[PDB]
Write a protein that binds this ligand. Structure first.
Ligand code: PRO
Ligand code: PRO
Lengths: 237, 237
């Protein structure tokens, strides 16, 4: 009868918790651990000076890291000396100032930790991206530079949604922008049902969107201000 | 001249360290963290008794986990009451005793920690596999059961070797059996050049196999008794 929608919501919610707990959180945690391992290989002295030293070394490293972190688009460091080192090849103007860019700014105002930006447009070719960034420092809080990676979580998104026919799984940020989704063309754009943000009450839950006839389970991520959404259209086997 | 082989070995060694440090160790660490998250969801009471309770729940969980841990073949628990719960579907004899199997035995003699077996043959269909296992306990060291996963690291192996044309990357265990390799048919079998085990001096190094004209870099893994081998045939661009 209608108890079908009972077991169905509790299952959709259980799958959302399990996916969050054993896939999403371990995936992000490793990516951020790998980020910190790359970051710790960076010596301030190589980048607090007018010219960059030992760059051939970091670009050799970064090419290798990108080769196994499939969500990454660029790995780079901008410096307070307006230097910019980047793999792969990226060109910018001479009016380009790294220090004014959102990854540089967010990282500077949270020294000692990494931080994820809102989606923003690449300075040169305009592409939507998201950055994870951390400030490089030297002494009494002198920010000599900022290390960051541009990412588009399409590989992550595909693995999240691999086993999911019928439903789909998405992740949204604090403002409803799509961090992960089965369709690459929706990434980093606003979510399709913005009213859902006001239904994400508490750390998790389930509800039914009578407007789009979709069951919606949601779980909040602990260390990031994001929400995992499991969606099951009332079109169901 | 011959200084080509100089920069070449130091580069092959540098790539081996970087791959070990930023890919292999974070990959294994997440897999073992995900293992422990699955393991901690297991309540002794469900499995220290003649019959298993709430099995529909664990098989619902395990199907989901397998769906995102691509190296896994089976997820299971055997009990000291000779019960066996397993996803996906696995049949055995009535002469099957989990307690005598290598994952059960290794896990029982290292309670409180996880452990990787040597490669061994599936009881029923004979297939070569490797297991990660941990004992489930209750009080003064009563081993009520053992939780374990069968794995074949082909997905891991493909990601390790994705970016590598020219050379290849492999991982061997304490006894030279192949844990990871570009060719799936070599997995879990003895390495092709067993003499290399005696050249893996110390925590890392490089040497040249004059017999197979291959440069060989090696790095030992910290928390596992294994070796990462980067091989570059003297056939080179
Ligand atoms: O647009 C930016 O600010 C960053 C810099 C490197 C690539 N994208
Ligand atoms: O052969 C064994 O012992 C294990 C048990 C489950 C599947 N393979």
């Amino acid at each position: 009868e209608r108890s079908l929608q009972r077991e169905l919501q509790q299952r959709l919610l259980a799958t959302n918790h399990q996916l969050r707990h054993v896939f999403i959180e371990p995936y992000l945690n490793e990516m951020e651990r790998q980020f910190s391992l790359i970051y710790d290989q960076i010596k301030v002295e190589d980048i607090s000076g007018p010219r960059l030293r030992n760059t051939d070394s970091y670009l050799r490293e970064w090419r290798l890291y990108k080769g196994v972190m499939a969500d990454l688009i660029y790995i780079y460091v901008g410096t307070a000396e307006r230097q910019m080192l980047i793999y792969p090849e990226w060109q910018a103007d001479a009016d380009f100032d790294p220090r004014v860019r959102p990854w540089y700014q967010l990282a500077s105002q949270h020294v000692g930790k990494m931080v994820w930006t809102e989606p923003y447009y690449d300075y040169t070719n305009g592409t939507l991206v998201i950055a994870l960034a951390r400030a490089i420092t030297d002494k009494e809080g002198k920010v000599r530079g900022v290390f960051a990676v541009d990412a588009i979580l399409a590989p992550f998104s595909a693995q999240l949604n691999r086993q999911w026919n019928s439903g789909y799984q998405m992740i949204v940020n604090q403002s409803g922008k799509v961090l992960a989704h089965p369709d690459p063309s929706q990434l980093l754009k606003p979510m399709t049902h913005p009213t859902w943000l006001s239904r994400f009450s508490g750390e998790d839950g389930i509800f039914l969107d009578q407007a789009s006839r979709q069951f919606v389970a949601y779980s909040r991520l602990p260390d990031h201000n994001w929400v995992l959404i499991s969606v099951l259209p009332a079109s169901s086997i």
